[PDB]
Design a protein around this nucleic acid. Structure first.
Lengths: 83, 81, 95, 80, 73, 72, 162, 82, 48
RNA sequence: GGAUUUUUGGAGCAGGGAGAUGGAAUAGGAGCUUGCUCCGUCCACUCCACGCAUCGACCUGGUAUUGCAGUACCUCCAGGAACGGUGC
């Protein structure tokens, strides 16, 4: 099937999430779409670039195999999948 | 409504033209292995004819001949000609 | 099933893991390089497709910088070893 | 035959798992599954070049372990 | 084995971010379920400022970290 | 066209040089390559930095260490 | 009612408004602080509003703490060996207590990492040359009573009591 | 047995591959050992770079965290369900 | 002056092994019994 | 159910050079204690190449905004650089 965490990630789409890639760059933006293999596309990205350089990208697509973690919005803390 | 260039088509175009292909390496920014692609298979493992490593630091090219570069090392397939 | 069990024994007899098969045939040590640069000298009790190993009488040697780096070794008696950390298995070790 | 099935028939056995990030986790196995994730209790866990901390229980993922150190008092021929 | 949803990014100028800090830009021309991309007008930009136009490349998917849409998609 | 499994099947017995991803080189006659491309080489001299360094002889190389394998 | 681990285990444990780990101890009328080490060093800020704590003492070694909130208590004397047990503190909130003498603030210079202090609604605020004595006594504090320190205050802190 | 389900809803410390520490309320997991951690805080060890500088631990507050399973090394418990 | 502690130790290991001579015989018997076993017999003894 | 986004890992290792510079209270060897001489482990300062450039957090002074909102972060100028990571 699909696990509970990827279901939570799919619930998080449409909201502002924060990805950290494997290279340590922090991509905070609105999660447009997420995928079963944690491929995330985000709009309004503010990238940190691992030395502090916060730039603003629009419409990134992050490969899920490089995602270290995903800070989801805290308003999903009451989701019924988390129960 | 759009038609797609899937990458096996383009690696097979590299095969058909016998074009010398520069191959980048995964987690190895210094070395790029270039050679004429004779053939390749499912996991993007390639065989190369007159392949040579190009270390970008030393700017030296070491000739190898016919190699089988394993597919998981590949980052990019660049055509030099 | 049973045809896979005959297939795996003939494949482990003729394929690349033959030396591991040979290490369980006449019970001789193999020298195994690991991803953290530890050499393992020891017999193999059992193996699988992944080169996961169950090993006896293992001498793990490695080189540690404190200068000149020294060959600090340890003796692990019986062990299990995950197969993705195995680099190189050489069937006959010299010493 | 798979050797993860050999590892799953270990419970309340005190092993010392060396992880992939240079970690040494000495504890008794409470559970291993088919994906080699090992759940230990009474853990003395030493990170790389650090002091041994102790934890009540640990749950190591399967790919992150490098090797085991099994007890010497283990009949493995009956375990295989 | 589901393919990535890069149908927005097709025939649009991308800015890939490959591993090792490598950076290529170009028009995404195709993709597979492994996220191996095909890049047209691919310009490699190194740590030096000078940029090598390398034309038409196949990028293996496991080296891609990220891709920015330089067009609106 | 010459795919890697026909290339390795025609490569068996010949002296081949396997360069690992980590700078290690191995010159030996290729004995057997399975479909998962675990390679088995015989009479293998381990060459590091292009220099003859060890004689390992019979050897199994696991698949995920091989950068490339060539003929020599 | 005396404080034990029982009132620790049942109380609200959460993330505060400033996004640290918080244990709440409001409205317990605690006279003496003891047996805090059952929090297992998972906390950064502990509140103590509405307790009858006569002296801020009995503090065990908790390394992760960055805030103590001692709002509205009866602190007449202060503990001295606090820096050995709370090494990484940043805020000390000593509002609405009964500190009267200047030397009663003297143990607070031992906390090296201290940055924010609040000693409001205290008789020790009432005396002259107070704030300069706090700056000259505890130099590492950057915000005193929600007033940022200035270099004129540092200079007239160094000038007095030479 | 499904051992990780016993560790659910606890305050759990999760060790990442690069050395980070994730202390969060372990809400959910799956086959790949992804984690959902509520109120999660990350902890980076900081190299001292001097002979006399100490080694410090920088803590970031994160919130609701999806941790991809390929990053995870080992998980231990810190506390009861709050 | 230098080898004192080791020489005292060599005497203590001697006198303690004499006091534990029954237990030393029992370990040696147990090693010989554990060595001679099949797989299953070893696993069953490790369960006791 | 070991071949690119999760579980059989691309991980391991080392911090530039010099100076009749300084220290190993209880812990180096050799010239077979102590004093001296030599050599493969740090920190503090000085010199060359404050290792370099970048942005974020942060401290002093001056300065602008008096505004009802659910947040990567928020005025500007100048000095200092204790911290983080990026490429060489």
């Amino acid at each position: 099937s699909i696990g509970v965490p990827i279901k939570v990630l799919h619930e998080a789409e449409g909201h502002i999430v924060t990805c950290e890639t494997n290279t340590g760059e922090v991509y905070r933006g609105k999660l447009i779409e997420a995928e079963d293999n944690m491929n995330c596309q985000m709009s309004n990205i503010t990238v940190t670039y691992r030395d502090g350089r916060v730039a603003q990208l629009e419409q990134v697509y992050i490969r899920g195999s490089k995602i270290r973690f995903l800070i989801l919005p805290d308003m999903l803390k009451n989701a019924p999948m988390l129960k | 409504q759009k038609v797609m260039v899937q990458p096996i088509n383009l690696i097979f175009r590299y095969l058909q033209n016998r074009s010398r292909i520069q191959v980048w390496l995964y987690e190895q920014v210094n070395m790029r292995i270039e050679g004429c692609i004779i053939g390749f298979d499912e996991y993007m493992n390639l065989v190369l004819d007159d392949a040579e490593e190009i270390h970008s630091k030393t700017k030296s090219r070491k000739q190898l001949g016919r190699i089988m570069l394993k597919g998981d090392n590949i980052t990019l397939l660049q055509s030099v000609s | 099933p049973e045809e896979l069990q005959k297939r795996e024994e003939e494949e482990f007899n003729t394929g690349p893991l033959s030396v591991l098969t040979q290490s369980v045939k006449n019970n001789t040590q193999v020298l195994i390089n690991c991803r953290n640069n530890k050499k393992l000298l020891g017999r193999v009790k059992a193996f699988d497709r992944h080169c996961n190993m169950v090993l006896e009488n293992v001498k793990e040697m490695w080189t540690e910088v404190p200068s000149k780096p020294v060959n600090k070794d340890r003796y692990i008696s019986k062990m299990f070893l995950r197969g993705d950390s195995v680099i190189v298995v050489l069937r006959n070790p010299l010493i | 035959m798979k050797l993860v099935r050999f590892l799953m028939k270990l419970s309340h056995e005190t092993v010392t798992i060396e992880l992939k990030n240079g970690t040494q986790v000495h504890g008794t196995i409470t559970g291993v599954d088919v994906s080699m994730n090992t759940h230990l209790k009474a853990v003395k866990m030493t990170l790389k070049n650090r002091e041994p901390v102790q934890l009540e229980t640990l749950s190591i993922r399967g790919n992150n372990i490098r090797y085991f150190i099994l007890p010497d008092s283990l009949p493995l021929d009956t375990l295989l | 084995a589901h393919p990535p949803e890069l149908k927005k990014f097709m025939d649009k100028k991308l800015s890939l971010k490959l591993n090792g800090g490598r950076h290529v830009q170009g028009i995404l021309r195709g993709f597979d379920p492994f996220m191996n991309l095909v890049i047209d007008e691919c310009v490699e930009m190194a740590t030096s400022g000078q940029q090598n136009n390398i034309g038409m490349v196949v990028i293996r998917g496991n080296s891609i970290i990220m891709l920015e849409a330089l067009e609106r998609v | 066209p010459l795919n890697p499994k026909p290339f390795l099947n025609g490569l068996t017995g010949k002296p081949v040089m396997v360069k690992l991803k980590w700078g290690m080189e191995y010159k030996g006659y290729l004995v057997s390559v399975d479909g998962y491309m675990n390679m088995q080489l015989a009479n293998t001299e381990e060459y590091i930095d292009g220099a003859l360094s060890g004689h390992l002889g019979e050897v199994l190389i696991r698949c995920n260490n091989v950068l490339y394998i060539r003929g020599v | 009612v005396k404080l034990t681990a029982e009132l620790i285990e049942q109380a609200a444990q959460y993330t505060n408004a400033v996004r640290d780990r918080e244990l709440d101890l409001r409205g317990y009328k605690i006279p003496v602080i003891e047996n805090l080490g059952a929090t297992l060093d998972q906390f950064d800020a502990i509140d103590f509003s509405d307790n009858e704590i006569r002296k801020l003492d009995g503090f065990p070694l908790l390394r992760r703490l960055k805030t103590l909130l001692v709002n509205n208590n009866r602190i007449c004397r202060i503990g001295e060996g606090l820096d050995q047990a709370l090494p990484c503190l940043t805020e000390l909130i000593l509002t609405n207590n009964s500190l009267v003498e200047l030397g009663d603030l003297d143990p607070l210079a031992s906390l090296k990492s201290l940055t924010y202090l609040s000693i409001l609604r205290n008789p020790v605020t009432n005396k002259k040359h107070y704030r300069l004595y706090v700056i000259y006594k505890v130099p590492q504090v950057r915000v005193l009573d929600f007033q940022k320190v200035k270099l004129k205050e540092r200079q007239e802190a160094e000038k007095m009591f030479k | 047995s499904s051992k990780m389900l016993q560790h659910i809803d606890y305050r759990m410390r999760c060790i990442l591959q690069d050395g980070r520490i994730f202390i969060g309320t372990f809400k959910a997991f799956d086959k790949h050992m992804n984690l959902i951690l509520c109120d999660c805080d990350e902890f980076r060890k900081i190299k001292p770079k001097n002979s006399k500088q100490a080694e410090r631990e920088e803590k970031r507050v994160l919130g609701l965290v999806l941790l991809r399973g390929e990053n995870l090394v080992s998980m231990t418990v810190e506390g009861p369900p709050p | 002056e230098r080898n004192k502690d080791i020489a005292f130790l060599e005497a203590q290991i001697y006198e303690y092994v004499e006091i534990l001579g029954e237990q030393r015989h029992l370990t040696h018997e147990n090693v010989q019994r554990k060595q001679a076993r099949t797989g299953e017999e070893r696993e069953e003894e490790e369960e006791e």
